[PDB]
Amino acid sequence: AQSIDQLIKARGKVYFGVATDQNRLTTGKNAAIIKADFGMVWPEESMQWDATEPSQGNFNFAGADYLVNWAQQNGKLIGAGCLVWHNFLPSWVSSITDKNTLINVMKNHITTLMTRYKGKIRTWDVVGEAFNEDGSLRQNVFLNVIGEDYIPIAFQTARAADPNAKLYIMDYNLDSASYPKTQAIVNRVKQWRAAGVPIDGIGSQMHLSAGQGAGVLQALPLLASAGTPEVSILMLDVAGASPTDYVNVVNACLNVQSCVGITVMGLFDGNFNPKPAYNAIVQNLQ
Numbered sequence: 001a002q003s004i005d006q007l008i009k010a011r012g013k014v015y016f017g018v019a020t021d022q023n024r025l026t027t028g029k030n031a032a033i034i035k036a037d038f039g040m041v042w043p044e045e046s047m048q049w050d051a052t053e054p055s056q057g058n059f060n061f062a063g064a065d066y067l068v069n070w071a072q073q074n075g076k077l078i079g080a081g082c083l084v085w086h087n088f089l090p091s092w093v094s095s096i097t098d099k100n101t102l103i104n105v106m107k108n109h110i111t112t113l114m115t116r117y118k119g120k121i122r123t124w125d126v127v128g129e130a131f132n133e134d135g136s137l138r139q140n141v142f143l144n145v146i147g148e149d150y151i152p153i154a155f156q157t158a159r160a161a162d163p164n165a166k167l168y169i170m171d172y173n174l175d176s177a178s179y180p181k182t183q184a185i186v187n188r189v190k191q192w193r194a195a196g197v198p199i200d201g202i203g204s205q206m207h208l209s210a211g212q213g214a215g216v217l218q219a220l221p222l223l224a225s226a227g228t229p230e231v232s233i234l235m236l237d238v239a240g241a242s243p244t245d246y247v248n249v250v251n252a253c254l255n256v257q258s259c260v261g262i263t264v265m266g267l268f269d270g271n272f273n274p275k276p277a278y279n280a281i282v283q284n285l286q
């Protein structure tokens with residue numbers, strides 16, 4: 001009966017969120033569930049580079065506009081992204097080898113997307129999956145052609161394009177304080193923020209095997225130690241939809257003042273009926 005997003009707001013957090021897209025909002029009972037239980041929606045695909053700028057200069061916003069308008073009309077916060085990362089990246093971008101050209105292309109992409117939705121977007125994932133597992137920077141086209149300054153540039157461009165949005169760097173496999181990747185992103189966000197880079201948040205996307213949720217009790221505090229005003233959580237997957245892993249992640253967020261909420265990607269079975277993880281989360285937040 002009770003809404004998870006309502007319950008998490010009552011514990012002082014901002015949102016319980018879900019990642020969806022136009023195709024699912026128009027099918028059956030998807031819109032109703034989202035209205036009842038979630039306070040934020042994110043486009044799963046409609047805002048990625050190969051969706052929005054499949055050919056340079058030729059932007060496609062049909063699906064993203066649909067999601068944004070639906071969320072606005074139904075009072076849902078909007079997260080969007082990812083602006084800069086190696087996935088969903090057309091080959092016309094990764095074939096570029098000229099530094100100033102790539103700088104201009106990356107700025108045009110950031111500025112066109114954020115300007116279109118200026119003032120409407122709570123969180124922009126500006127840079128995604130920038131780190132290797134060993135803590136070194138991922139050798140995507142931006143790093144190779146621009147260098148490591150592409151991460152500052154991308155964040156300064158976004159801040160200028162829409163100063164109202166919270167700007168996030170996001171990555172996966174940050175679920176343990178013992179991982180080199182978790183420590184490296186903290187150290188580097190610290191350095192970037194000291195040099196004035198407007199990284200408002202770190203988003204931890206979690207591919208959880210059974211038992212890895214406990215790790216977040218110690219990793220989320222470590223991530224919050226980079227000093228961003230916000231951190232957040234995305235549940236990409238949980239092995240066996242294990243209730244205990246879900247509850248530990250929720251409790252990690254409740255323990256970290258700067259954690260604003262949790263998003264799940266797509267807790268419900270094929271007939272849109274709550275699963276045990278659902279009930280466990282509600283009972284924990286109750």
Ligand SMILES: [Ca+2]
Nearest residue numbers: 207208209212
């Ligand atoms: Ca994992």
